Amino acid sequence: GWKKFLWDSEKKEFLGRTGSSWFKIFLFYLIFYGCLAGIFIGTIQVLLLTLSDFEPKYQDRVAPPGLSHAPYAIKTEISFSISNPKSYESFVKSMHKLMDLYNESSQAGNSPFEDCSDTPADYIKRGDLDDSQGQKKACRFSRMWLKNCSGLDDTTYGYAEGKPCVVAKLNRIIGFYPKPLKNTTDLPEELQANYNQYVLPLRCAAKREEDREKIGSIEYFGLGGYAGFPLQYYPYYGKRLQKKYLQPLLAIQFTNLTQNMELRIECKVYGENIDYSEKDRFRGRFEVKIEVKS
Amino acid sequence: DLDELKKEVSMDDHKLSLDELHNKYGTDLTRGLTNARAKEILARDGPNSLTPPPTTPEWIKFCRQLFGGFSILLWIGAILCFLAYGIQAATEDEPANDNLYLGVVLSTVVIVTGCFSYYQEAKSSRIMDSFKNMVPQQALVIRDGEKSTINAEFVVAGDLVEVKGGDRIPADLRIISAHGCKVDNSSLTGESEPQTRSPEFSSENPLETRNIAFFSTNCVEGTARGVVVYTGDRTVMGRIATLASGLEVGRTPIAIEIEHFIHIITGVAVFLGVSFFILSLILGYSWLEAVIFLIGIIVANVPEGLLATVTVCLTLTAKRMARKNCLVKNLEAVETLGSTSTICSDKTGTLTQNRMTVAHMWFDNQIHEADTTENQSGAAFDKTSATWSALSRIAALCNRAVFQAGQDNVPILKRSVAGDASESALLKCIELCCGSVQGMRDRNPKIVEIPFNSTNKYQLSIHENEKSSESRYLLVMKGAPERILDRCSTILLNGAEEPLKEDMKEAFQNAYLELGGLGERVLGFCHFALPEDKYNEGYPFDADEPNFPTTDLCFVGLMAMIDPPRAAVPDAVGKCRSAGIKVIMVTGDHPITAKAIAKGVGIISEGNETIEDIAARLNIPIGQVNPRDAKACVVHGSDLKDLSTEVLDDILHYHTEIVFARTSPQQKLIIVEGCQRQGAIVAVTGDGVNDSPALKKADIGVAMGISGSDVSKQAADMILLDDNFASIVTGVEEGRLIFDNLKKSIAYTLTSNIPEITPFLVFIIGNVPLPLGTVTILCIDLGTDMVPAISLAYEQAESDIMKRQPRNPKTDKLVNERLISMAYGQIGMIQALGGFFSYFVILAENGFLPMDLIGKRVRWDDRWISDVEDSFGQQWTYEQRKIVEFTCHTSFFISIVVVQWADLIICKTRRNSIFQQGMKNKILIFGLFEETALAAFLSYCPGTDVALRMYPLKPSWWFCAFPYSLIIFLYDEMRRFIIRRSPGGWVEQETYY
């Protein structure tokens, strides 16, 4: 048994078959698997021919847009000590990674960054989604616009003395036009003042009624000094048609933050084609847990 | 419980004198034992009762089933699943419910399968309980010179015991004085033959001598005295009962096959796991991940429903059998009949009817045959001559038996008749083709009868003659043909009379040897008209002196009789021999009768010859002929007792038509063992208690139901509720059928494992998002697949299954590598390609092209990265990309159903084409329809994307798996084509299951 089924010397068999059998079977599986591979490849090439290069066929799974943030906090918590410097390093490295893409050196020349209104403005249509007029042009977004959170003056961005910043960003969607709420009698309390039609408002608050008092002065920095996103940076034409495109950003400084206590801060954007979801806690709004323990 | 000392042939002391036997046991022949001595021996030896077996509680067997089959492989996972929950609850992270609802689902699978395996687990025989109901409650013992009826259990060795016709023998006795006592050794010999117990000794074999009564028997008539030689577990049918309860059951073929199948499965699961561990170490993953990957791959290769599916498969055939009065106590046994290669049958009560029946008749120098079949479906014997009428008068008048009161409803053959078997057979034949014997008997008043004498060797009687024109006296007599031949001088030929010249005397001798050689018992009938001038109507012929002329009688004709075989016995034996099944007769009957029934049923084909037949045809001694020129052999039990192991092997190895005669029960067990030894499955069909040790060690027992006993009925695995032998032929057809079907269903359930394991292998290797989810694999394995696979069992035959030879146990298996090469190698691979195709399509239409999917899992899984760029530059949050992955699980599951359509169609026929067999199976069609309705329901019902995480599909996706299905159909169709045109080629030794 043990020895024979391994090698017998009368029938010159190994493991059970002879030399010619292993060859017939190996050749059969090589041809079979080769045909399988060729068929799968052909059915994938017809797929490359079906879709378009400038536009995803289905855009229903990404609407309305989300709201992401830097830094990169795990479990949506930003906890760091004001004394130990090796506590907020993982945060600064991220913040820096995000802002490092808005360097002025990158935005230079006429293309593909054209100078746009220093004050919020309306939409700008650079034609259709075609290759006729080549690479489109995107508006320039300067770092300095963000006042106290730019890494140009205080590299740390605030984490050094108990005053952190949070750079909020709206998820890029192809052909998405942001629509802000109108001046009619129905509008949230907050939004009434400084209604600039051309700005999509972003406003943070406290999740619970108690935490209100423990949260200090939320100071928003942005284009034109408003707490929102200028409509002029839309719509987005996609990577293929608009490489070297920069999306607006909004800085938020949480000055006067109570020490040694977990604070739940919920930020929320407002607008017509903006809708929240009780399941996705990043659709339109976002939550952050801040605790400057020192 | 030494088994070898129970397989040996019994021993005794019947050769000793009465007095000598008393010295050996300590007693008084006329006064018995004393109450003090009797009680002293009651404390010395123990009670006279068959003891009970050791018993097994049920929480034991159900629990045994829990840690069995591959339930062990599932335990490592249910328990592991919880361990992670405990860690989460104690480390404080997710209150979610994934892990837990899985440890609960896997645990539930194990518990339910356990119920399915119990339903199939051999039932627990009650051999000893039935046996115990045998011994009567109170025996009659003579102690201190007085007769007393005491509890049979209080009988000891040495006391005096008296029996009376109708009571049971309370223990093994040594007859000391008898008065026409007769016993029924049915339980030991297998014959309802009334043997006589005499105080004298007559045979060297204790079972043949008359001076010994045996426990488990009854004194039919007369009274007798004796001494107790054996009480308890030491008796003969006691040694047989003790051997029966302590002879293992065996392990059926279906089980051994399941063992092999399990082995195979576990082999590829541990091979794929060790390989992806070495691979996970060559790429970089830590040891915690490599070990976790190994455990996942092994558990993933386990099919949850194939064991329970085999249970449902077997049950449907058992119901079909229940329709033809064939009930099987053991579900596993159902298949054993088809795999049997040698059927060891019993004669009296099984091959025959155990009812002496008038077979042949002699009259008018001509042999006449009578119908000897249960339902009377045959040929009449020409009832138009006067000779036959005179014969009916002789037999019907010179006969004292009468039907039992109140049988006016049953047929003429199955009714109860009080009397001997010869007078009963004659009474039944006359009542059959001559009308009511009660009127035939009152039509002629019997005047004087002289009972059968041991010296006269005949039975005679005189009656009045019902002829209203003849007031003479009629005298009739029956007896052995030789004695009656010496008392005649005339012959009733065609009605007239003629002398007894040597011409008809020689015709009578040849007729005697003709009916005798047929294994039948012949009797002679004659009559005479007494002259009313020498014996007037008033003269009384008192039975004292010669009042009747013994000689000068008128012989009318002979009448033979024998136990005939059941209606479908010859045809069934021929059908079994046609299928290559070796038939062997095993009976404790006389070799003349056994051999005659063998040639009459087909065991000894007409033309074959034994060594004695050759020595008789040549007129030379038997020691000269060569035993190789004899195909059929008759082995006697007395000789069987003195034979080595090799000799029995040679007896079965060189003789094709064998018959064991005068064999005890222990020898029956020996013969069955001599068969299994070489390497074949055995089936034993019986009725009496001496078949109990043969039914237990056999692979499958077939007990009759109407003509049987309670021991054979309880010790069997299959019961024939109508004594219709043909059910054996049906079982050999269905066994093979239900065998060929399990292969198809197994290949069907083994093909979907590939498109179920490959996605995780690509998840760990190619670093793409997860294609198939856990809640989808479970919905397939226990949902969709079950109904189409349970329906595969109802498939009809392709060729005549009753033509091929019995399968080989060592070489032909149930699950071979040729199947693995198809399910795991060719069909399952295509199914995997179709699933991955639909997958890539869903991700390409939403924005994730195939070039950007490789290397994304690390960020595709992270719960805190709310900006994942796709091939077009869009930014997807975490929950948004997860919704798409789940919609990919739903379409992957639907692709699996689509490919299972073509798999169920290519699995319907193993060789034949679909355009030949046909889609006449309504269950398979229903399976396809339901399989599709369930997938649509799981995807489109609201709240399913919340409960089970399955999102709706867009109508263009459902068509991504269609081409792969058609291709599977075409490939298997051309496969099942070269096999037909080219028998024995590459395609056959490489892909024919």
Ligand SMILES: C=C(/C=C\C[C@@H](O)[C@@H](O)[C@H](O)C/C=C/C=C\[C@@H](O)C[C@@H]1O[C@H](C[C@@H](O)[C@H](O)C[C@H]2O[C@H]([C@H](O)[C@H](O)CC[C@H](O)/C=C/[C@H](C)[C@@H](O)C[C@]3(O)O[C@H](C[C@@H](O)CCCCCCC[C@@]45C[C@@H](C)C[C@@](C)(O4)[C@@H](C[C@@H](C)CCCCC[C@@H](O)[C@H](O)[C@H](O)[C@@H](O)[C@H](O)[C@H]4O[C@H](C[C@H](O)[C@H](O)/C(C)=C/[C@H](O)C[C@@H](C)[C@H](O)C(=O)N/C=C/C(=O)NCCCO)[C@H](O)[C@@H](O)[C@@H]4O)O5)[C@H](O)[C@@H](O)[C@H]3O)C[C@@H](O)[C@@H]2O)[C@@H](O)[C@H](O)[C@H]1O)CC[C@H](O)[C@@H](O)[C@H](O)[C@H](C)C[C@H]1O[C@H](/C=C\[C@@H](O)[C@H](O)C[C@@H]2C[C@@H]3C[C@H](O2)[C@@H](CC[C@H]2O[C@H](CN)C[C@H]2O)O3)[C@@H](O)[C@H](O)[C@H]1O
């Ligand atoms: C319940 C289950 C189990 C897990 C379930 C799990 O999911 C969940 O329950 C979670 O756990 C929940 C549990 C939660 C528990 C607690 C939480 O609540 C609480 C929270 O947890 C959170 C964390 C949580 O968030 C976590 O993240 C959860 C995840 O956890 C797992 C993580 O990943 C991972 O564990 C992270 C943990 C950590 O990282 C581990 C570290 C290690 C321990 C250790 O390293 C650290 C450390 O060192 O340990 C030290 C202690 C030491 O004594 C130990 C001794 C070490 C022994 C060394 C010997 C090694 C060994 C061993 C030999 C046998 C072989 C051998 C080769 O290697 C041999 C060789 C020797 C010679 C090596 C010697 C090396 C020496 C090393 C040692 O000395 C030590 O390192 C040393 O002492 C150190 O001190 C020292 O520092 C050293 O440092 C360095 C060492 C190196 O690093 C190291 O050595 C390295 C790199 C080795 C490398 O390999 C080497 C390589 C380079 C390579 O070799 C190489 O060169 N290659 C070169 C190639 C090359 O050139 N090529 C050239 C090419 C040329 O062409 C240095 O080098 C050294 O020098 C130095 O000395 O010897 C000590 O402590 C410290 O030191 C410590 O630091 C993963 C998961 O568990 C979990 O997700 C926390 O953040 C939070 O704070 C807390 O609150 C059951 C599983 C399920 O069944 C299954 O479903 C499962 O779930 C899936 C599989 C999951 C997967 O899929 C998921 C998605 C879906 C799945 O779920 C679906 O289920 C899929 C399913 C699967 C199937 C199919 C289908 O689909 C479904 C269907 C099934 C159904 O259908 C079926 C029918 N068909 C029926 C039914 O079954 O089932 C995914 O989501 C998953 O992610 C995925 O995994």
Ligand SMILES: *[C@@H]1O[C@H](CO[C@@H]2O[C@@H](C)[C@@H](O)[C@@H](O)[C@@H]2O)[C@@H](O[C@@H]2O[C@H](CO)[C@@H](O[C@@H]3O[C@H](CO[C@H]4O[C@H](CO)[C@@H](O)[C@H](O)[C@@H]4O)[C@@H](O)[C@H](O[C@H]4O[C@H](CO)[C@@H](O)[C@H](O)[C@@H]4O)[C@@H]3O)[C@H](O)[C@H]2NC(C)=O)[C@H](O)[C@H]1NC(C)=O
């Ligand atoms: C985008 O701009 C980034 C900032 O650009 C600077 O400011 C703008 C407004 C302009 O004036 C521009 O010219 C400036 O450079 C730019 O990142 C910068 O890159 C330089 C070059 O590597 C870095 O200088 C090096 O600094 C380290 C120590 O850095 C400390 O601080 C930073 C935070 O600022 C921490 O992250 C570090 O851990 C340290 O704590 C020096 O050790 C290093 O020495 C090298 O140079 C000296 C000569 O000066 C040599 O003797 C040595 O051998 C070394 O070769 C450098 O001086 C600078 O830190 C860094 N800034 C930040 C904030 O990280 C970024 O690369 C630009 N990106 C793109 C895509 O354009």
Ligand SMILES: *[C@@H]1O[C@H](CO[C@@H]2O[C@@H](C)[C@@H](O)[C@@H](O)[C@@H]2O)[C@@H](O[C@@H]2O[C@H](CO)[C@@H](O[C@@H]3O[C@H](CO)[C@@H](O)[C@H](O[C@H]4O[C@H](CO)[C@@H](O)[C@H](O)[C@@H]4O)[C@@H]3O)[C@H](O)[C@H]2NC(C)=O)[C@H](O)[C@H]1NC(C)=O
């Ligand atoms: C968006 O909408 C707000 C509010 O609009 C008002 O309410 C809407 C729901 C709707 O009914 C509108 O028709 C309605 O105007 C606009 O801001 C408002 O602007 C007016 C005009 O300046 C302010 O009214 C002022 O109220 C003062 C005290 O609170 C009063 O002293 C002011 O006097 C001025 O007007 C009088 C004549 O009435 C004149 O004599 C004076 O000399 C002086 O000019 C004046 O009445 C409202 O307070 C403003 N509302 C708020 C919340 O600040 C806003 O401009 C508009 N934005 C855009 C871009 O269109």
Ligand SMILES: CCCCCCCC/C=C\CCCCCCCC(=O)OC[C@H](COP(=O)(O)OCC[N+](C)(C)C)OC(=O)CCCCCCC/C=C\CCCCCCCC
């Ligand atoms: C991401 C990538 C995806 C990967 C997916 C992998 C999916 C896995 C798919 C299939 C698993 C295959 C594992 C092997 C299966 C072998 C089946 C087997 O073991 O069944 C058992 C049979 C017994 O059969 P029986 O009862 O009829 O015997 C009766 C004998 N009587 C009667 C004479 C006594 O035993 C035998 O067959 C004898 C054993 C033969 C073992 C052969 C081993 C070959 C394995 C790998 C070869 C690879 C080489 C590749 C290189 C090629 C050259 C170019």
Ligand SMILES: CCCCCCCC/C=C\CCCCCCCC(=O)OC[C@H](COP(=O)(O)OCC[N+](C)(C)C)OC(=O)CCCCCCC/C=C\CCCCCCCC
């Ligand atoms: C691009 C898409 C790719 C899809 C690939 C997957 C395809 C798999 C699904 C269906 C395949 C259908 C194959 C068609 C085969 C037809 C064969 C046939 O017709 O052979 C004729 C037989 C032979 O007769 P005979 O001579 O032996 O009769 C003797 C009568 N005597 C005895 C009285 C003389 O006749 C008979 O079988 C009797 C009549 C039976 C009629 C059957 C009709 C039902 C057929 C299919 C059901 C539909 C399933 C749909 C599943 C989707 C669910 C949503």
Ligand SMILES: CCCCCCCC/C=C\CCCCCCCC(=O)OC[C@H](COP(=O)(O)OCC[N+](C)(C)C)OC(=O)CCCCCCC/C=C\CCCCCCCC
């Ligand atoms: C022909 C012979 C057939 C024989 C087969 C036997 C038939 C079996 C019949 C019925 C058994 C099906 C049981 C399915 C149980 C689903 C339980 C479920 O959906 O519970 C939902 C939970 C809820 O969780 P929560 O409260 O935290 O949500 C909080 C949400 N907030 C807070 C956002 C509002 O979600 C979760 O547990 C999430 C995890 C989801 C776990 C799904 C496990 C299902 C496992 C197998 C399914 C197989 C059944 C297929 C049907 C076959 C029909 C023949």
Ligand SMILES: CCCCCCCC/C=C\CCCCCCCC(=O)OC[C@H](COP(=O)(O)OCC[N+](C)(C)C)OC(=O)CCCCCCC/C=C\CCCCCCCC
């Ligand atoms: C998306 C999924 C797509 C899947 C498509 C799969 C297509 C690939 C199908 C077949 C390709 C494999 C061909 C392999 C040919 C080399 C095999 C070889 O070396 O074989 C040698 C033998 C000759 O040796 P011997 O027997 O004389 O020696 C006797 C020796 N002793 C004793 C061992 C028997 O060859 C022979 O016997 C002849 C046997 C040749 C095998 C015929 C199998 C044909 C199966 C399918 C073709 C139909 C495709 C339909 C697709 C429709 C698409 C819409």
Ligand SMILES: *[C@@H]1O[C@H](CO)[C@@H](O[C@@H]2O[C@H](CO)[C@@H](O)[C@H](O)[C@H]2NC(C)=O)[C@H](O)[C@H]1NC(C)=O
């Ligand atoms: C920032 O918060 C501090 C409290 O932490 C406020 O200053 C307090 O003001 C109260 C009077 O309302 C005094 O009793 C406390 O002594 C003050 N504490 C400190 C530390 O100054 C302060 O007004 C807040 N400033 C802003 C801009 O929100």
Ligand SMILES: CC(C)CCC[C@@H](C)[C@H]1CC[C@H]2[C@@H]3CC=C4C[C@@H](O)CC[C@]4(C)[C@H]3CC[C@]12C
């Ligand atoms: C019936 C079977 C055997 C036919 C299999 C045909 C195979 C060989 C054919 C089908 C589709 C073909 C592919 C179609 C498109 C391209 C893209 C081109 O830029 C390189 C060649 C490549 C990748 C082709 C290679 C050959 C290919 C894979």
Ligand SMILES: CC(C)CCC[C@@H](C)[C@H]1CC[C@H]2[C@@H]3CC=C4C[C@@H](O)CC[C@]4(C)[C@H]3CC[C@]12C
């Ligand atoms: C017999 C063989 C060669 C026919 C193979 C037909 C191939 C070319 C057909 C069969 C099914 C078809 C697919 C069916 C559904 C869709 C979804 C749609 O949104 C894009 C096209 C796509 C992906 C089709 C591409 C072409 C396709 C793959």
Ligand code: ALF
């Ligand atoms: F009928 Al007997 F052995 F043949 F039981």
Ligand SMILES: [Mg+2]
């Ligand atoms: Mg019998």
Ligand code: NA
């Ligand atoms: Na399976």
Ligand code: NA
């Ligand atoms: Na048995």
